C-alpha cells in the first residue's frame with residue numbers, strides 16, 4: 001500500500017483507532033507497516049532526559065520535549081515518570097510496601113470495572129520464578145501476594161505466535177489457524193513467516209481474540225501489539241497515559257509484551273550467566289508499571305496478569321539430525337525444520353512422491369534417533385495438532401535438546417544459538433508462568449498447573465464478557481478467582497438408556513461363536529439374578545453413569561464385576577466401568593476358555609457382533625473391555641466373554657491392551673489403593689478431536705457392520721487421599737487417563753520386539769490425556785454423581801498426568 005506520510009501526529013500520539021492507508025498513522029503499530037506520519041519519532045517517541053525523575057527535576061517547568069515529566073502538573077496530565085511520587089513526594093516504591101489483601105476494588109470515581117492489564121513475557125520458563133527470584137523482587141511480590149501456578153502448560157508447538165494467539169482466543173492452533181511461526185496454506189497458495197508482510201493479512205487469523213470480544217460487547221481495548229523499536233519504558237508510559245483518558249474514551253483491557261527473556265535465551269541458553277540481566281530488566285519494567293499504577297491510585301483497582309508464552313531449552317548446532325542421512329530423495333521434499341518437522345512434496349506435479357516410503361525411511365533407522373515421524377492423525381491426541389490444512393500430513397516430533405534439518409548446509413548457510421523451544425508441550429523446559437494479582441484474584445493462593453487455553457474464559461470473566469466458543473472448560477479455573485466466578489450447569493443427558501432383561505434364547509443367535517461354558521445350585525441362582533439387575537453397581541460405577549450427550553440407542557448391562565453402556569448402533573460398549581481394589585487378585589484365562597465368546601441373551605442377534613467376521617478378517621482380532629484377568633471368581637469370569645464386552649483389536653494392539661489389563665491395572669490398584677476404570681472405544685477418522693457419526697467411519701471388520709475404533713481410552717480414578725480406598729473416598733479424586741492409538745503395527749515403539757515390560761507403559765505415557773479430551777471424542781459426560789463441587793470436577797476433567805520428574 002502507498003502512505004501520504006506528510007500528515008502529522010500532533011495530538012494523535014498512540015491513538016487507539018487506526019486510520020486506513022493512504023492516511024499516515026500514529027498508533028503503536030505504524031512502524032511495523034512503514035506508515036507513521038513524518039513527525040511520529042519527534043512527537044510520539046521522545047527520549048530527552050530518559051525515564052526517571054531525579055531530585056533536581058522535582059517541580060521543574062513543564063518542557064514538552066522530555067520523555068516523561070516531574071513538574072507539578074504531571075499527575076493531572078497523566079505523564080509523570082513512573083518514579084515521580086517516590087523521588088519528589090516522599091512515596092515508597094510499590095515493591096517496598098507490605099502485601100495487603102485487596103478484598104474489594106479500590107478504584108477512582110468513574111471506573112465502571114477494574115481494568116485488566118496482561119503483561120506477556122516471551123520465553124519465560126516456569127523455573128525462572130524460583131531460580132531468578134533474588135533479582136526479580138517486583139515479580140516475586142506479584143507471585144507471593146496474588147494467585148500463582150507452579151507452571152502453566154503452553155500449546156504445541158511451543159512457539160510464540162501459536163501460544164500468544166491461543167492466550168488471546170482460548171483455541172488450539174489447529175482451530176485458530178496459527179499452527180506455527182512458519183506456514184503454507186495450499187487453498188490460499190500463500191506462505192506466512194516471521195519477517196515480512198503476508199502475516200499481517202487477516203486471513204491467517206481465525207477465532208475471536210479478546211480485544212474483538214471486548215469491542216463487540218462495548219468494552220474498549222488498548223492495542224495488544226507493539227512495534228519492536230518502541231522501548232519498554234515508552235510502552236508502559238503509553239498504557240499509563242491511556243489509563244488517564246476520560247471514562248467514555250479509556251480502555252478497560254490493556255496488553256504489554258516483552259521480547260525478553262526469549263531473545264537472550266536463544267543466544268545464551270535458558271540459564272546462561274547472561275540471562276540474569278534480562279530478568280532484572282523485566283522486573284524493573286514490572287516495578288515501573290506498579291509504581292505508575294500506584295501514582296494513579298489504581299494499584300488496588302487493576303487486575304494484572306503476568307504470563308509467558310513458552311519456556312526455553314538448551315539446544316546447539318551440533319544436536320541436529322539431517323533428513324539427508326535417512327532419505328535418498330531429499331530434494332523431492334520441503335521441510336519446515338527445527339524443534340519440530342513438517343514434510344510435504346516440493347512439487348504437487350510430482351506423482352512419484354509417496355508419504356508411506358518417507359515415513360518408513362524415517363522410522364527407527366538409528367539406535368538413538370532424536371526424532372519420531374508420525375502421520376498427523378497418529379500424533380498423541382493431547383497435542384490437538386491435526387485438523388488444519390496448514391499442518392502437513394507428515395510430522396516429526398523432535399526430542400528435547402535437538403533440531404531436525406533437511407541437510408547440513410541448511411545449518412551453516414543461515415555455532416551461534418544455545419537455546420530454542422517448540423517441543424512437545426509436556427516437556428518441563430517448555431512450561432511457562434502464570435500470576436494473577438488484583439481485587440478479582442485470590443490473596444496468597446497457589447493453584448495447580450493448568451493449560452493456557454483456559455485463560456481466555458477467565459479474562460472474559462474479569463471484564464464481564466461472554467466468551468466466544470473456545471477450547472477452555474469454563475469454570476475449570478473458578479478457584480483462581482475471589483469473585484466473578486462463572487457458575488456452569490452440567491450438560492443435559494440427550495439419550496436415556498434401555499435396561500434390557502433376558503429376552504432371547506441361545507438358539508436364536510447364529511454368530512459362529514463357541515464357548516466351553518455348559519456347567520450347572522439355588523443359593524447362587526438368586527445371587528446371579530441380583531448381579532444382572534445391578535446389586536454390585538455401587539461398587540463398579542462410583543461417579544454415576546456417564547451421560548450420553550447425543551441422540552443414540554444404547555443399553556445398560558449389569559454384571560458382578562462391571563457395568564457397561566452398550567451401543568446398538570456401534571455394536572459395542574461406549575463405556576465399561578469397573579472397580580479393582582488394592583486386594584484384587586489377577587488370574588489367567590483358563591485353557592478351555594481361550595476362544596470362548598458367549599451370546600448375551602439381553603441383546604438381539606441383530607444388535608450383536610459375530611465371531612465369523614473376526615475369523616474371515618485376516619488383519620483384525622478382538623479383545624475385551626472388562627478384562628477376564630480381573631474376574632472376582634471363576635463363575636464371574638464367564639461374564640467377561642460376553643459378545644457385548646468384545647471390541648475389535650489388531651493383534652499388534654492386543655499386545656499393548658493385554659499388558660495394560662493383565663499387569664498395569666493391578667499395579668495402579670496396588671499404588672493408588674484401588675482404582676475405578678472406565679474404558680471404551682473412540683472413532684475419530686477425520687482427526688477433528690470430536691466423536692464421529694456412523695457415516696464418518698472408514699473401516700469395518702470385513703464383511704460386517706462392526707466399526708473399527710481409531711483409539712481406545714481408559715479413565716483411572718482413585719482417592720487423592722490414598723489412605724482411603726477408591727470405592728470409599730470422602731474427598732477429592734485423583735485421575736489419570738489415556739487415548740491409545742489403535743494401530744495395526746507397533747512401529748511407533750522402536751523397542752516393541754522386546755517384552756511389553758520395556759515399551760508398553762512408555763507408549764501409554766506418551767498418549768496421556770485429559771478426561772475432557774475423551775469427552776470431546778465420545779460425546780459422554782463423566783463424574784455426574786460425586787460429592788464434589790462442579791467447578792472442582794471441571795478442574796479434575798482438565799487435569800493431565802504428564803509423567804515429567
Ligand SMILES: *[C@@H]1O[C@H](CO)[C@@H](O[C@@H]2O[C@H](CO)[C@@H](O[C@@H]3O[C@H](CO[C@H]4O[C@H](CO)[C@@H](O)[C@H](O[C@H]5O[C@H](CO)[C@@H](O)[C@H](O)[C@@H]5O[C@H]5O[C@H](CO)[C@@H](O)[C@H](O)[C@@H]5O)[C@@H]4O)[C@@H](O)[C@H](O[C@H]4O[C@H](CO)[C@@H](O)[C@H](O)[C@@H]4O[C@H]4O[C@H](CO)[C@@H](O)[C@H](O)[C@@H]4O)[C@@H]3O)[C@H](O)[C@H]2NC(C)=O)[C@H](O)[C@H]1NC(C)=O
Pocket residue numbers: 171172174175176177203204205206207384387388389469470471688689690776
Ligand atoms: C475447539 O473449539 C472450537 C471453537 O468452538 C471448535 O471449533 C468449531 O467446531 C465446529 C465443528 O467442527 C465448527 O462448526 C462448523 O463450522 C462452519 C462455520 O464455519 C465458519 O464460521 C465460524 C463462526 O464465526 C468460524 O469460526 C469458522 O472459522 C474456521 O474457518 C476459518 C476460515 O476458513 C478459519 O480462519 C478459522 O481458523 C476456522 O478454521 C478451523 O475450523 C474449520 C471448520 O470451520 C476447519 O476446517 C479448520 O481446519 C480449522 O480447524 C468459519 O469461518 C459450519 O458451516 C459447519 O456446518 C456443516 O457441517 C455439518 C456436517 O455435514 C452439517 O450438518 C452442517 O449443516 C454443515 O454442512 C455443510 O457443510 C459441510 C462442510 O463444508 C459439507 O461437507 C456438507 O456436505 C454441507 O454442505 C460447522 O458448524 C466451528 O466452525 C469451529 N470453529 C472454530 C473457530 O474452529 C473445536 O471443535 C474445538 N476443539 C475440540 C477438540 O473440542
Ligand SMILES: NC(=O)[C@@H]1CCN1C(=O)COc1cccc2nsnc12
Pocket residue numbers: 160161162164165168224225226227228255257
Ligand atoms: N509486534 C510483534 O510482532 C511482537 C511479537 C509478538 N508481538 C507483540 O507485540 C504481542 O503479540 C501478541 C499479543 C497477543 C496476541 C498475539 N497473537 S501473535 N502475537 C500476539
Ligand SMILES: [Ca+2]
Pocket residue numbers: 122123159160161262309310
Ligand atoms: Ca515466544
Ligand SMILES: [Ca+2]
Pocket residue numbers: 683684685686687688689690691692
Ligand atoms: Ca471426528
Ligand SMILES: [K+]
Pocket residue numbers: 613614615616617618619620621
Ligand atoms: K481375524
Ligand code: NA
Pocket residue numbers: 746747748749750751752753
Ligand atoms: Na516397533
Ligand SMILES: [Zn+2]
Pocket residue numbers: 123160262263266421
Ligand atoms: Zn524464541
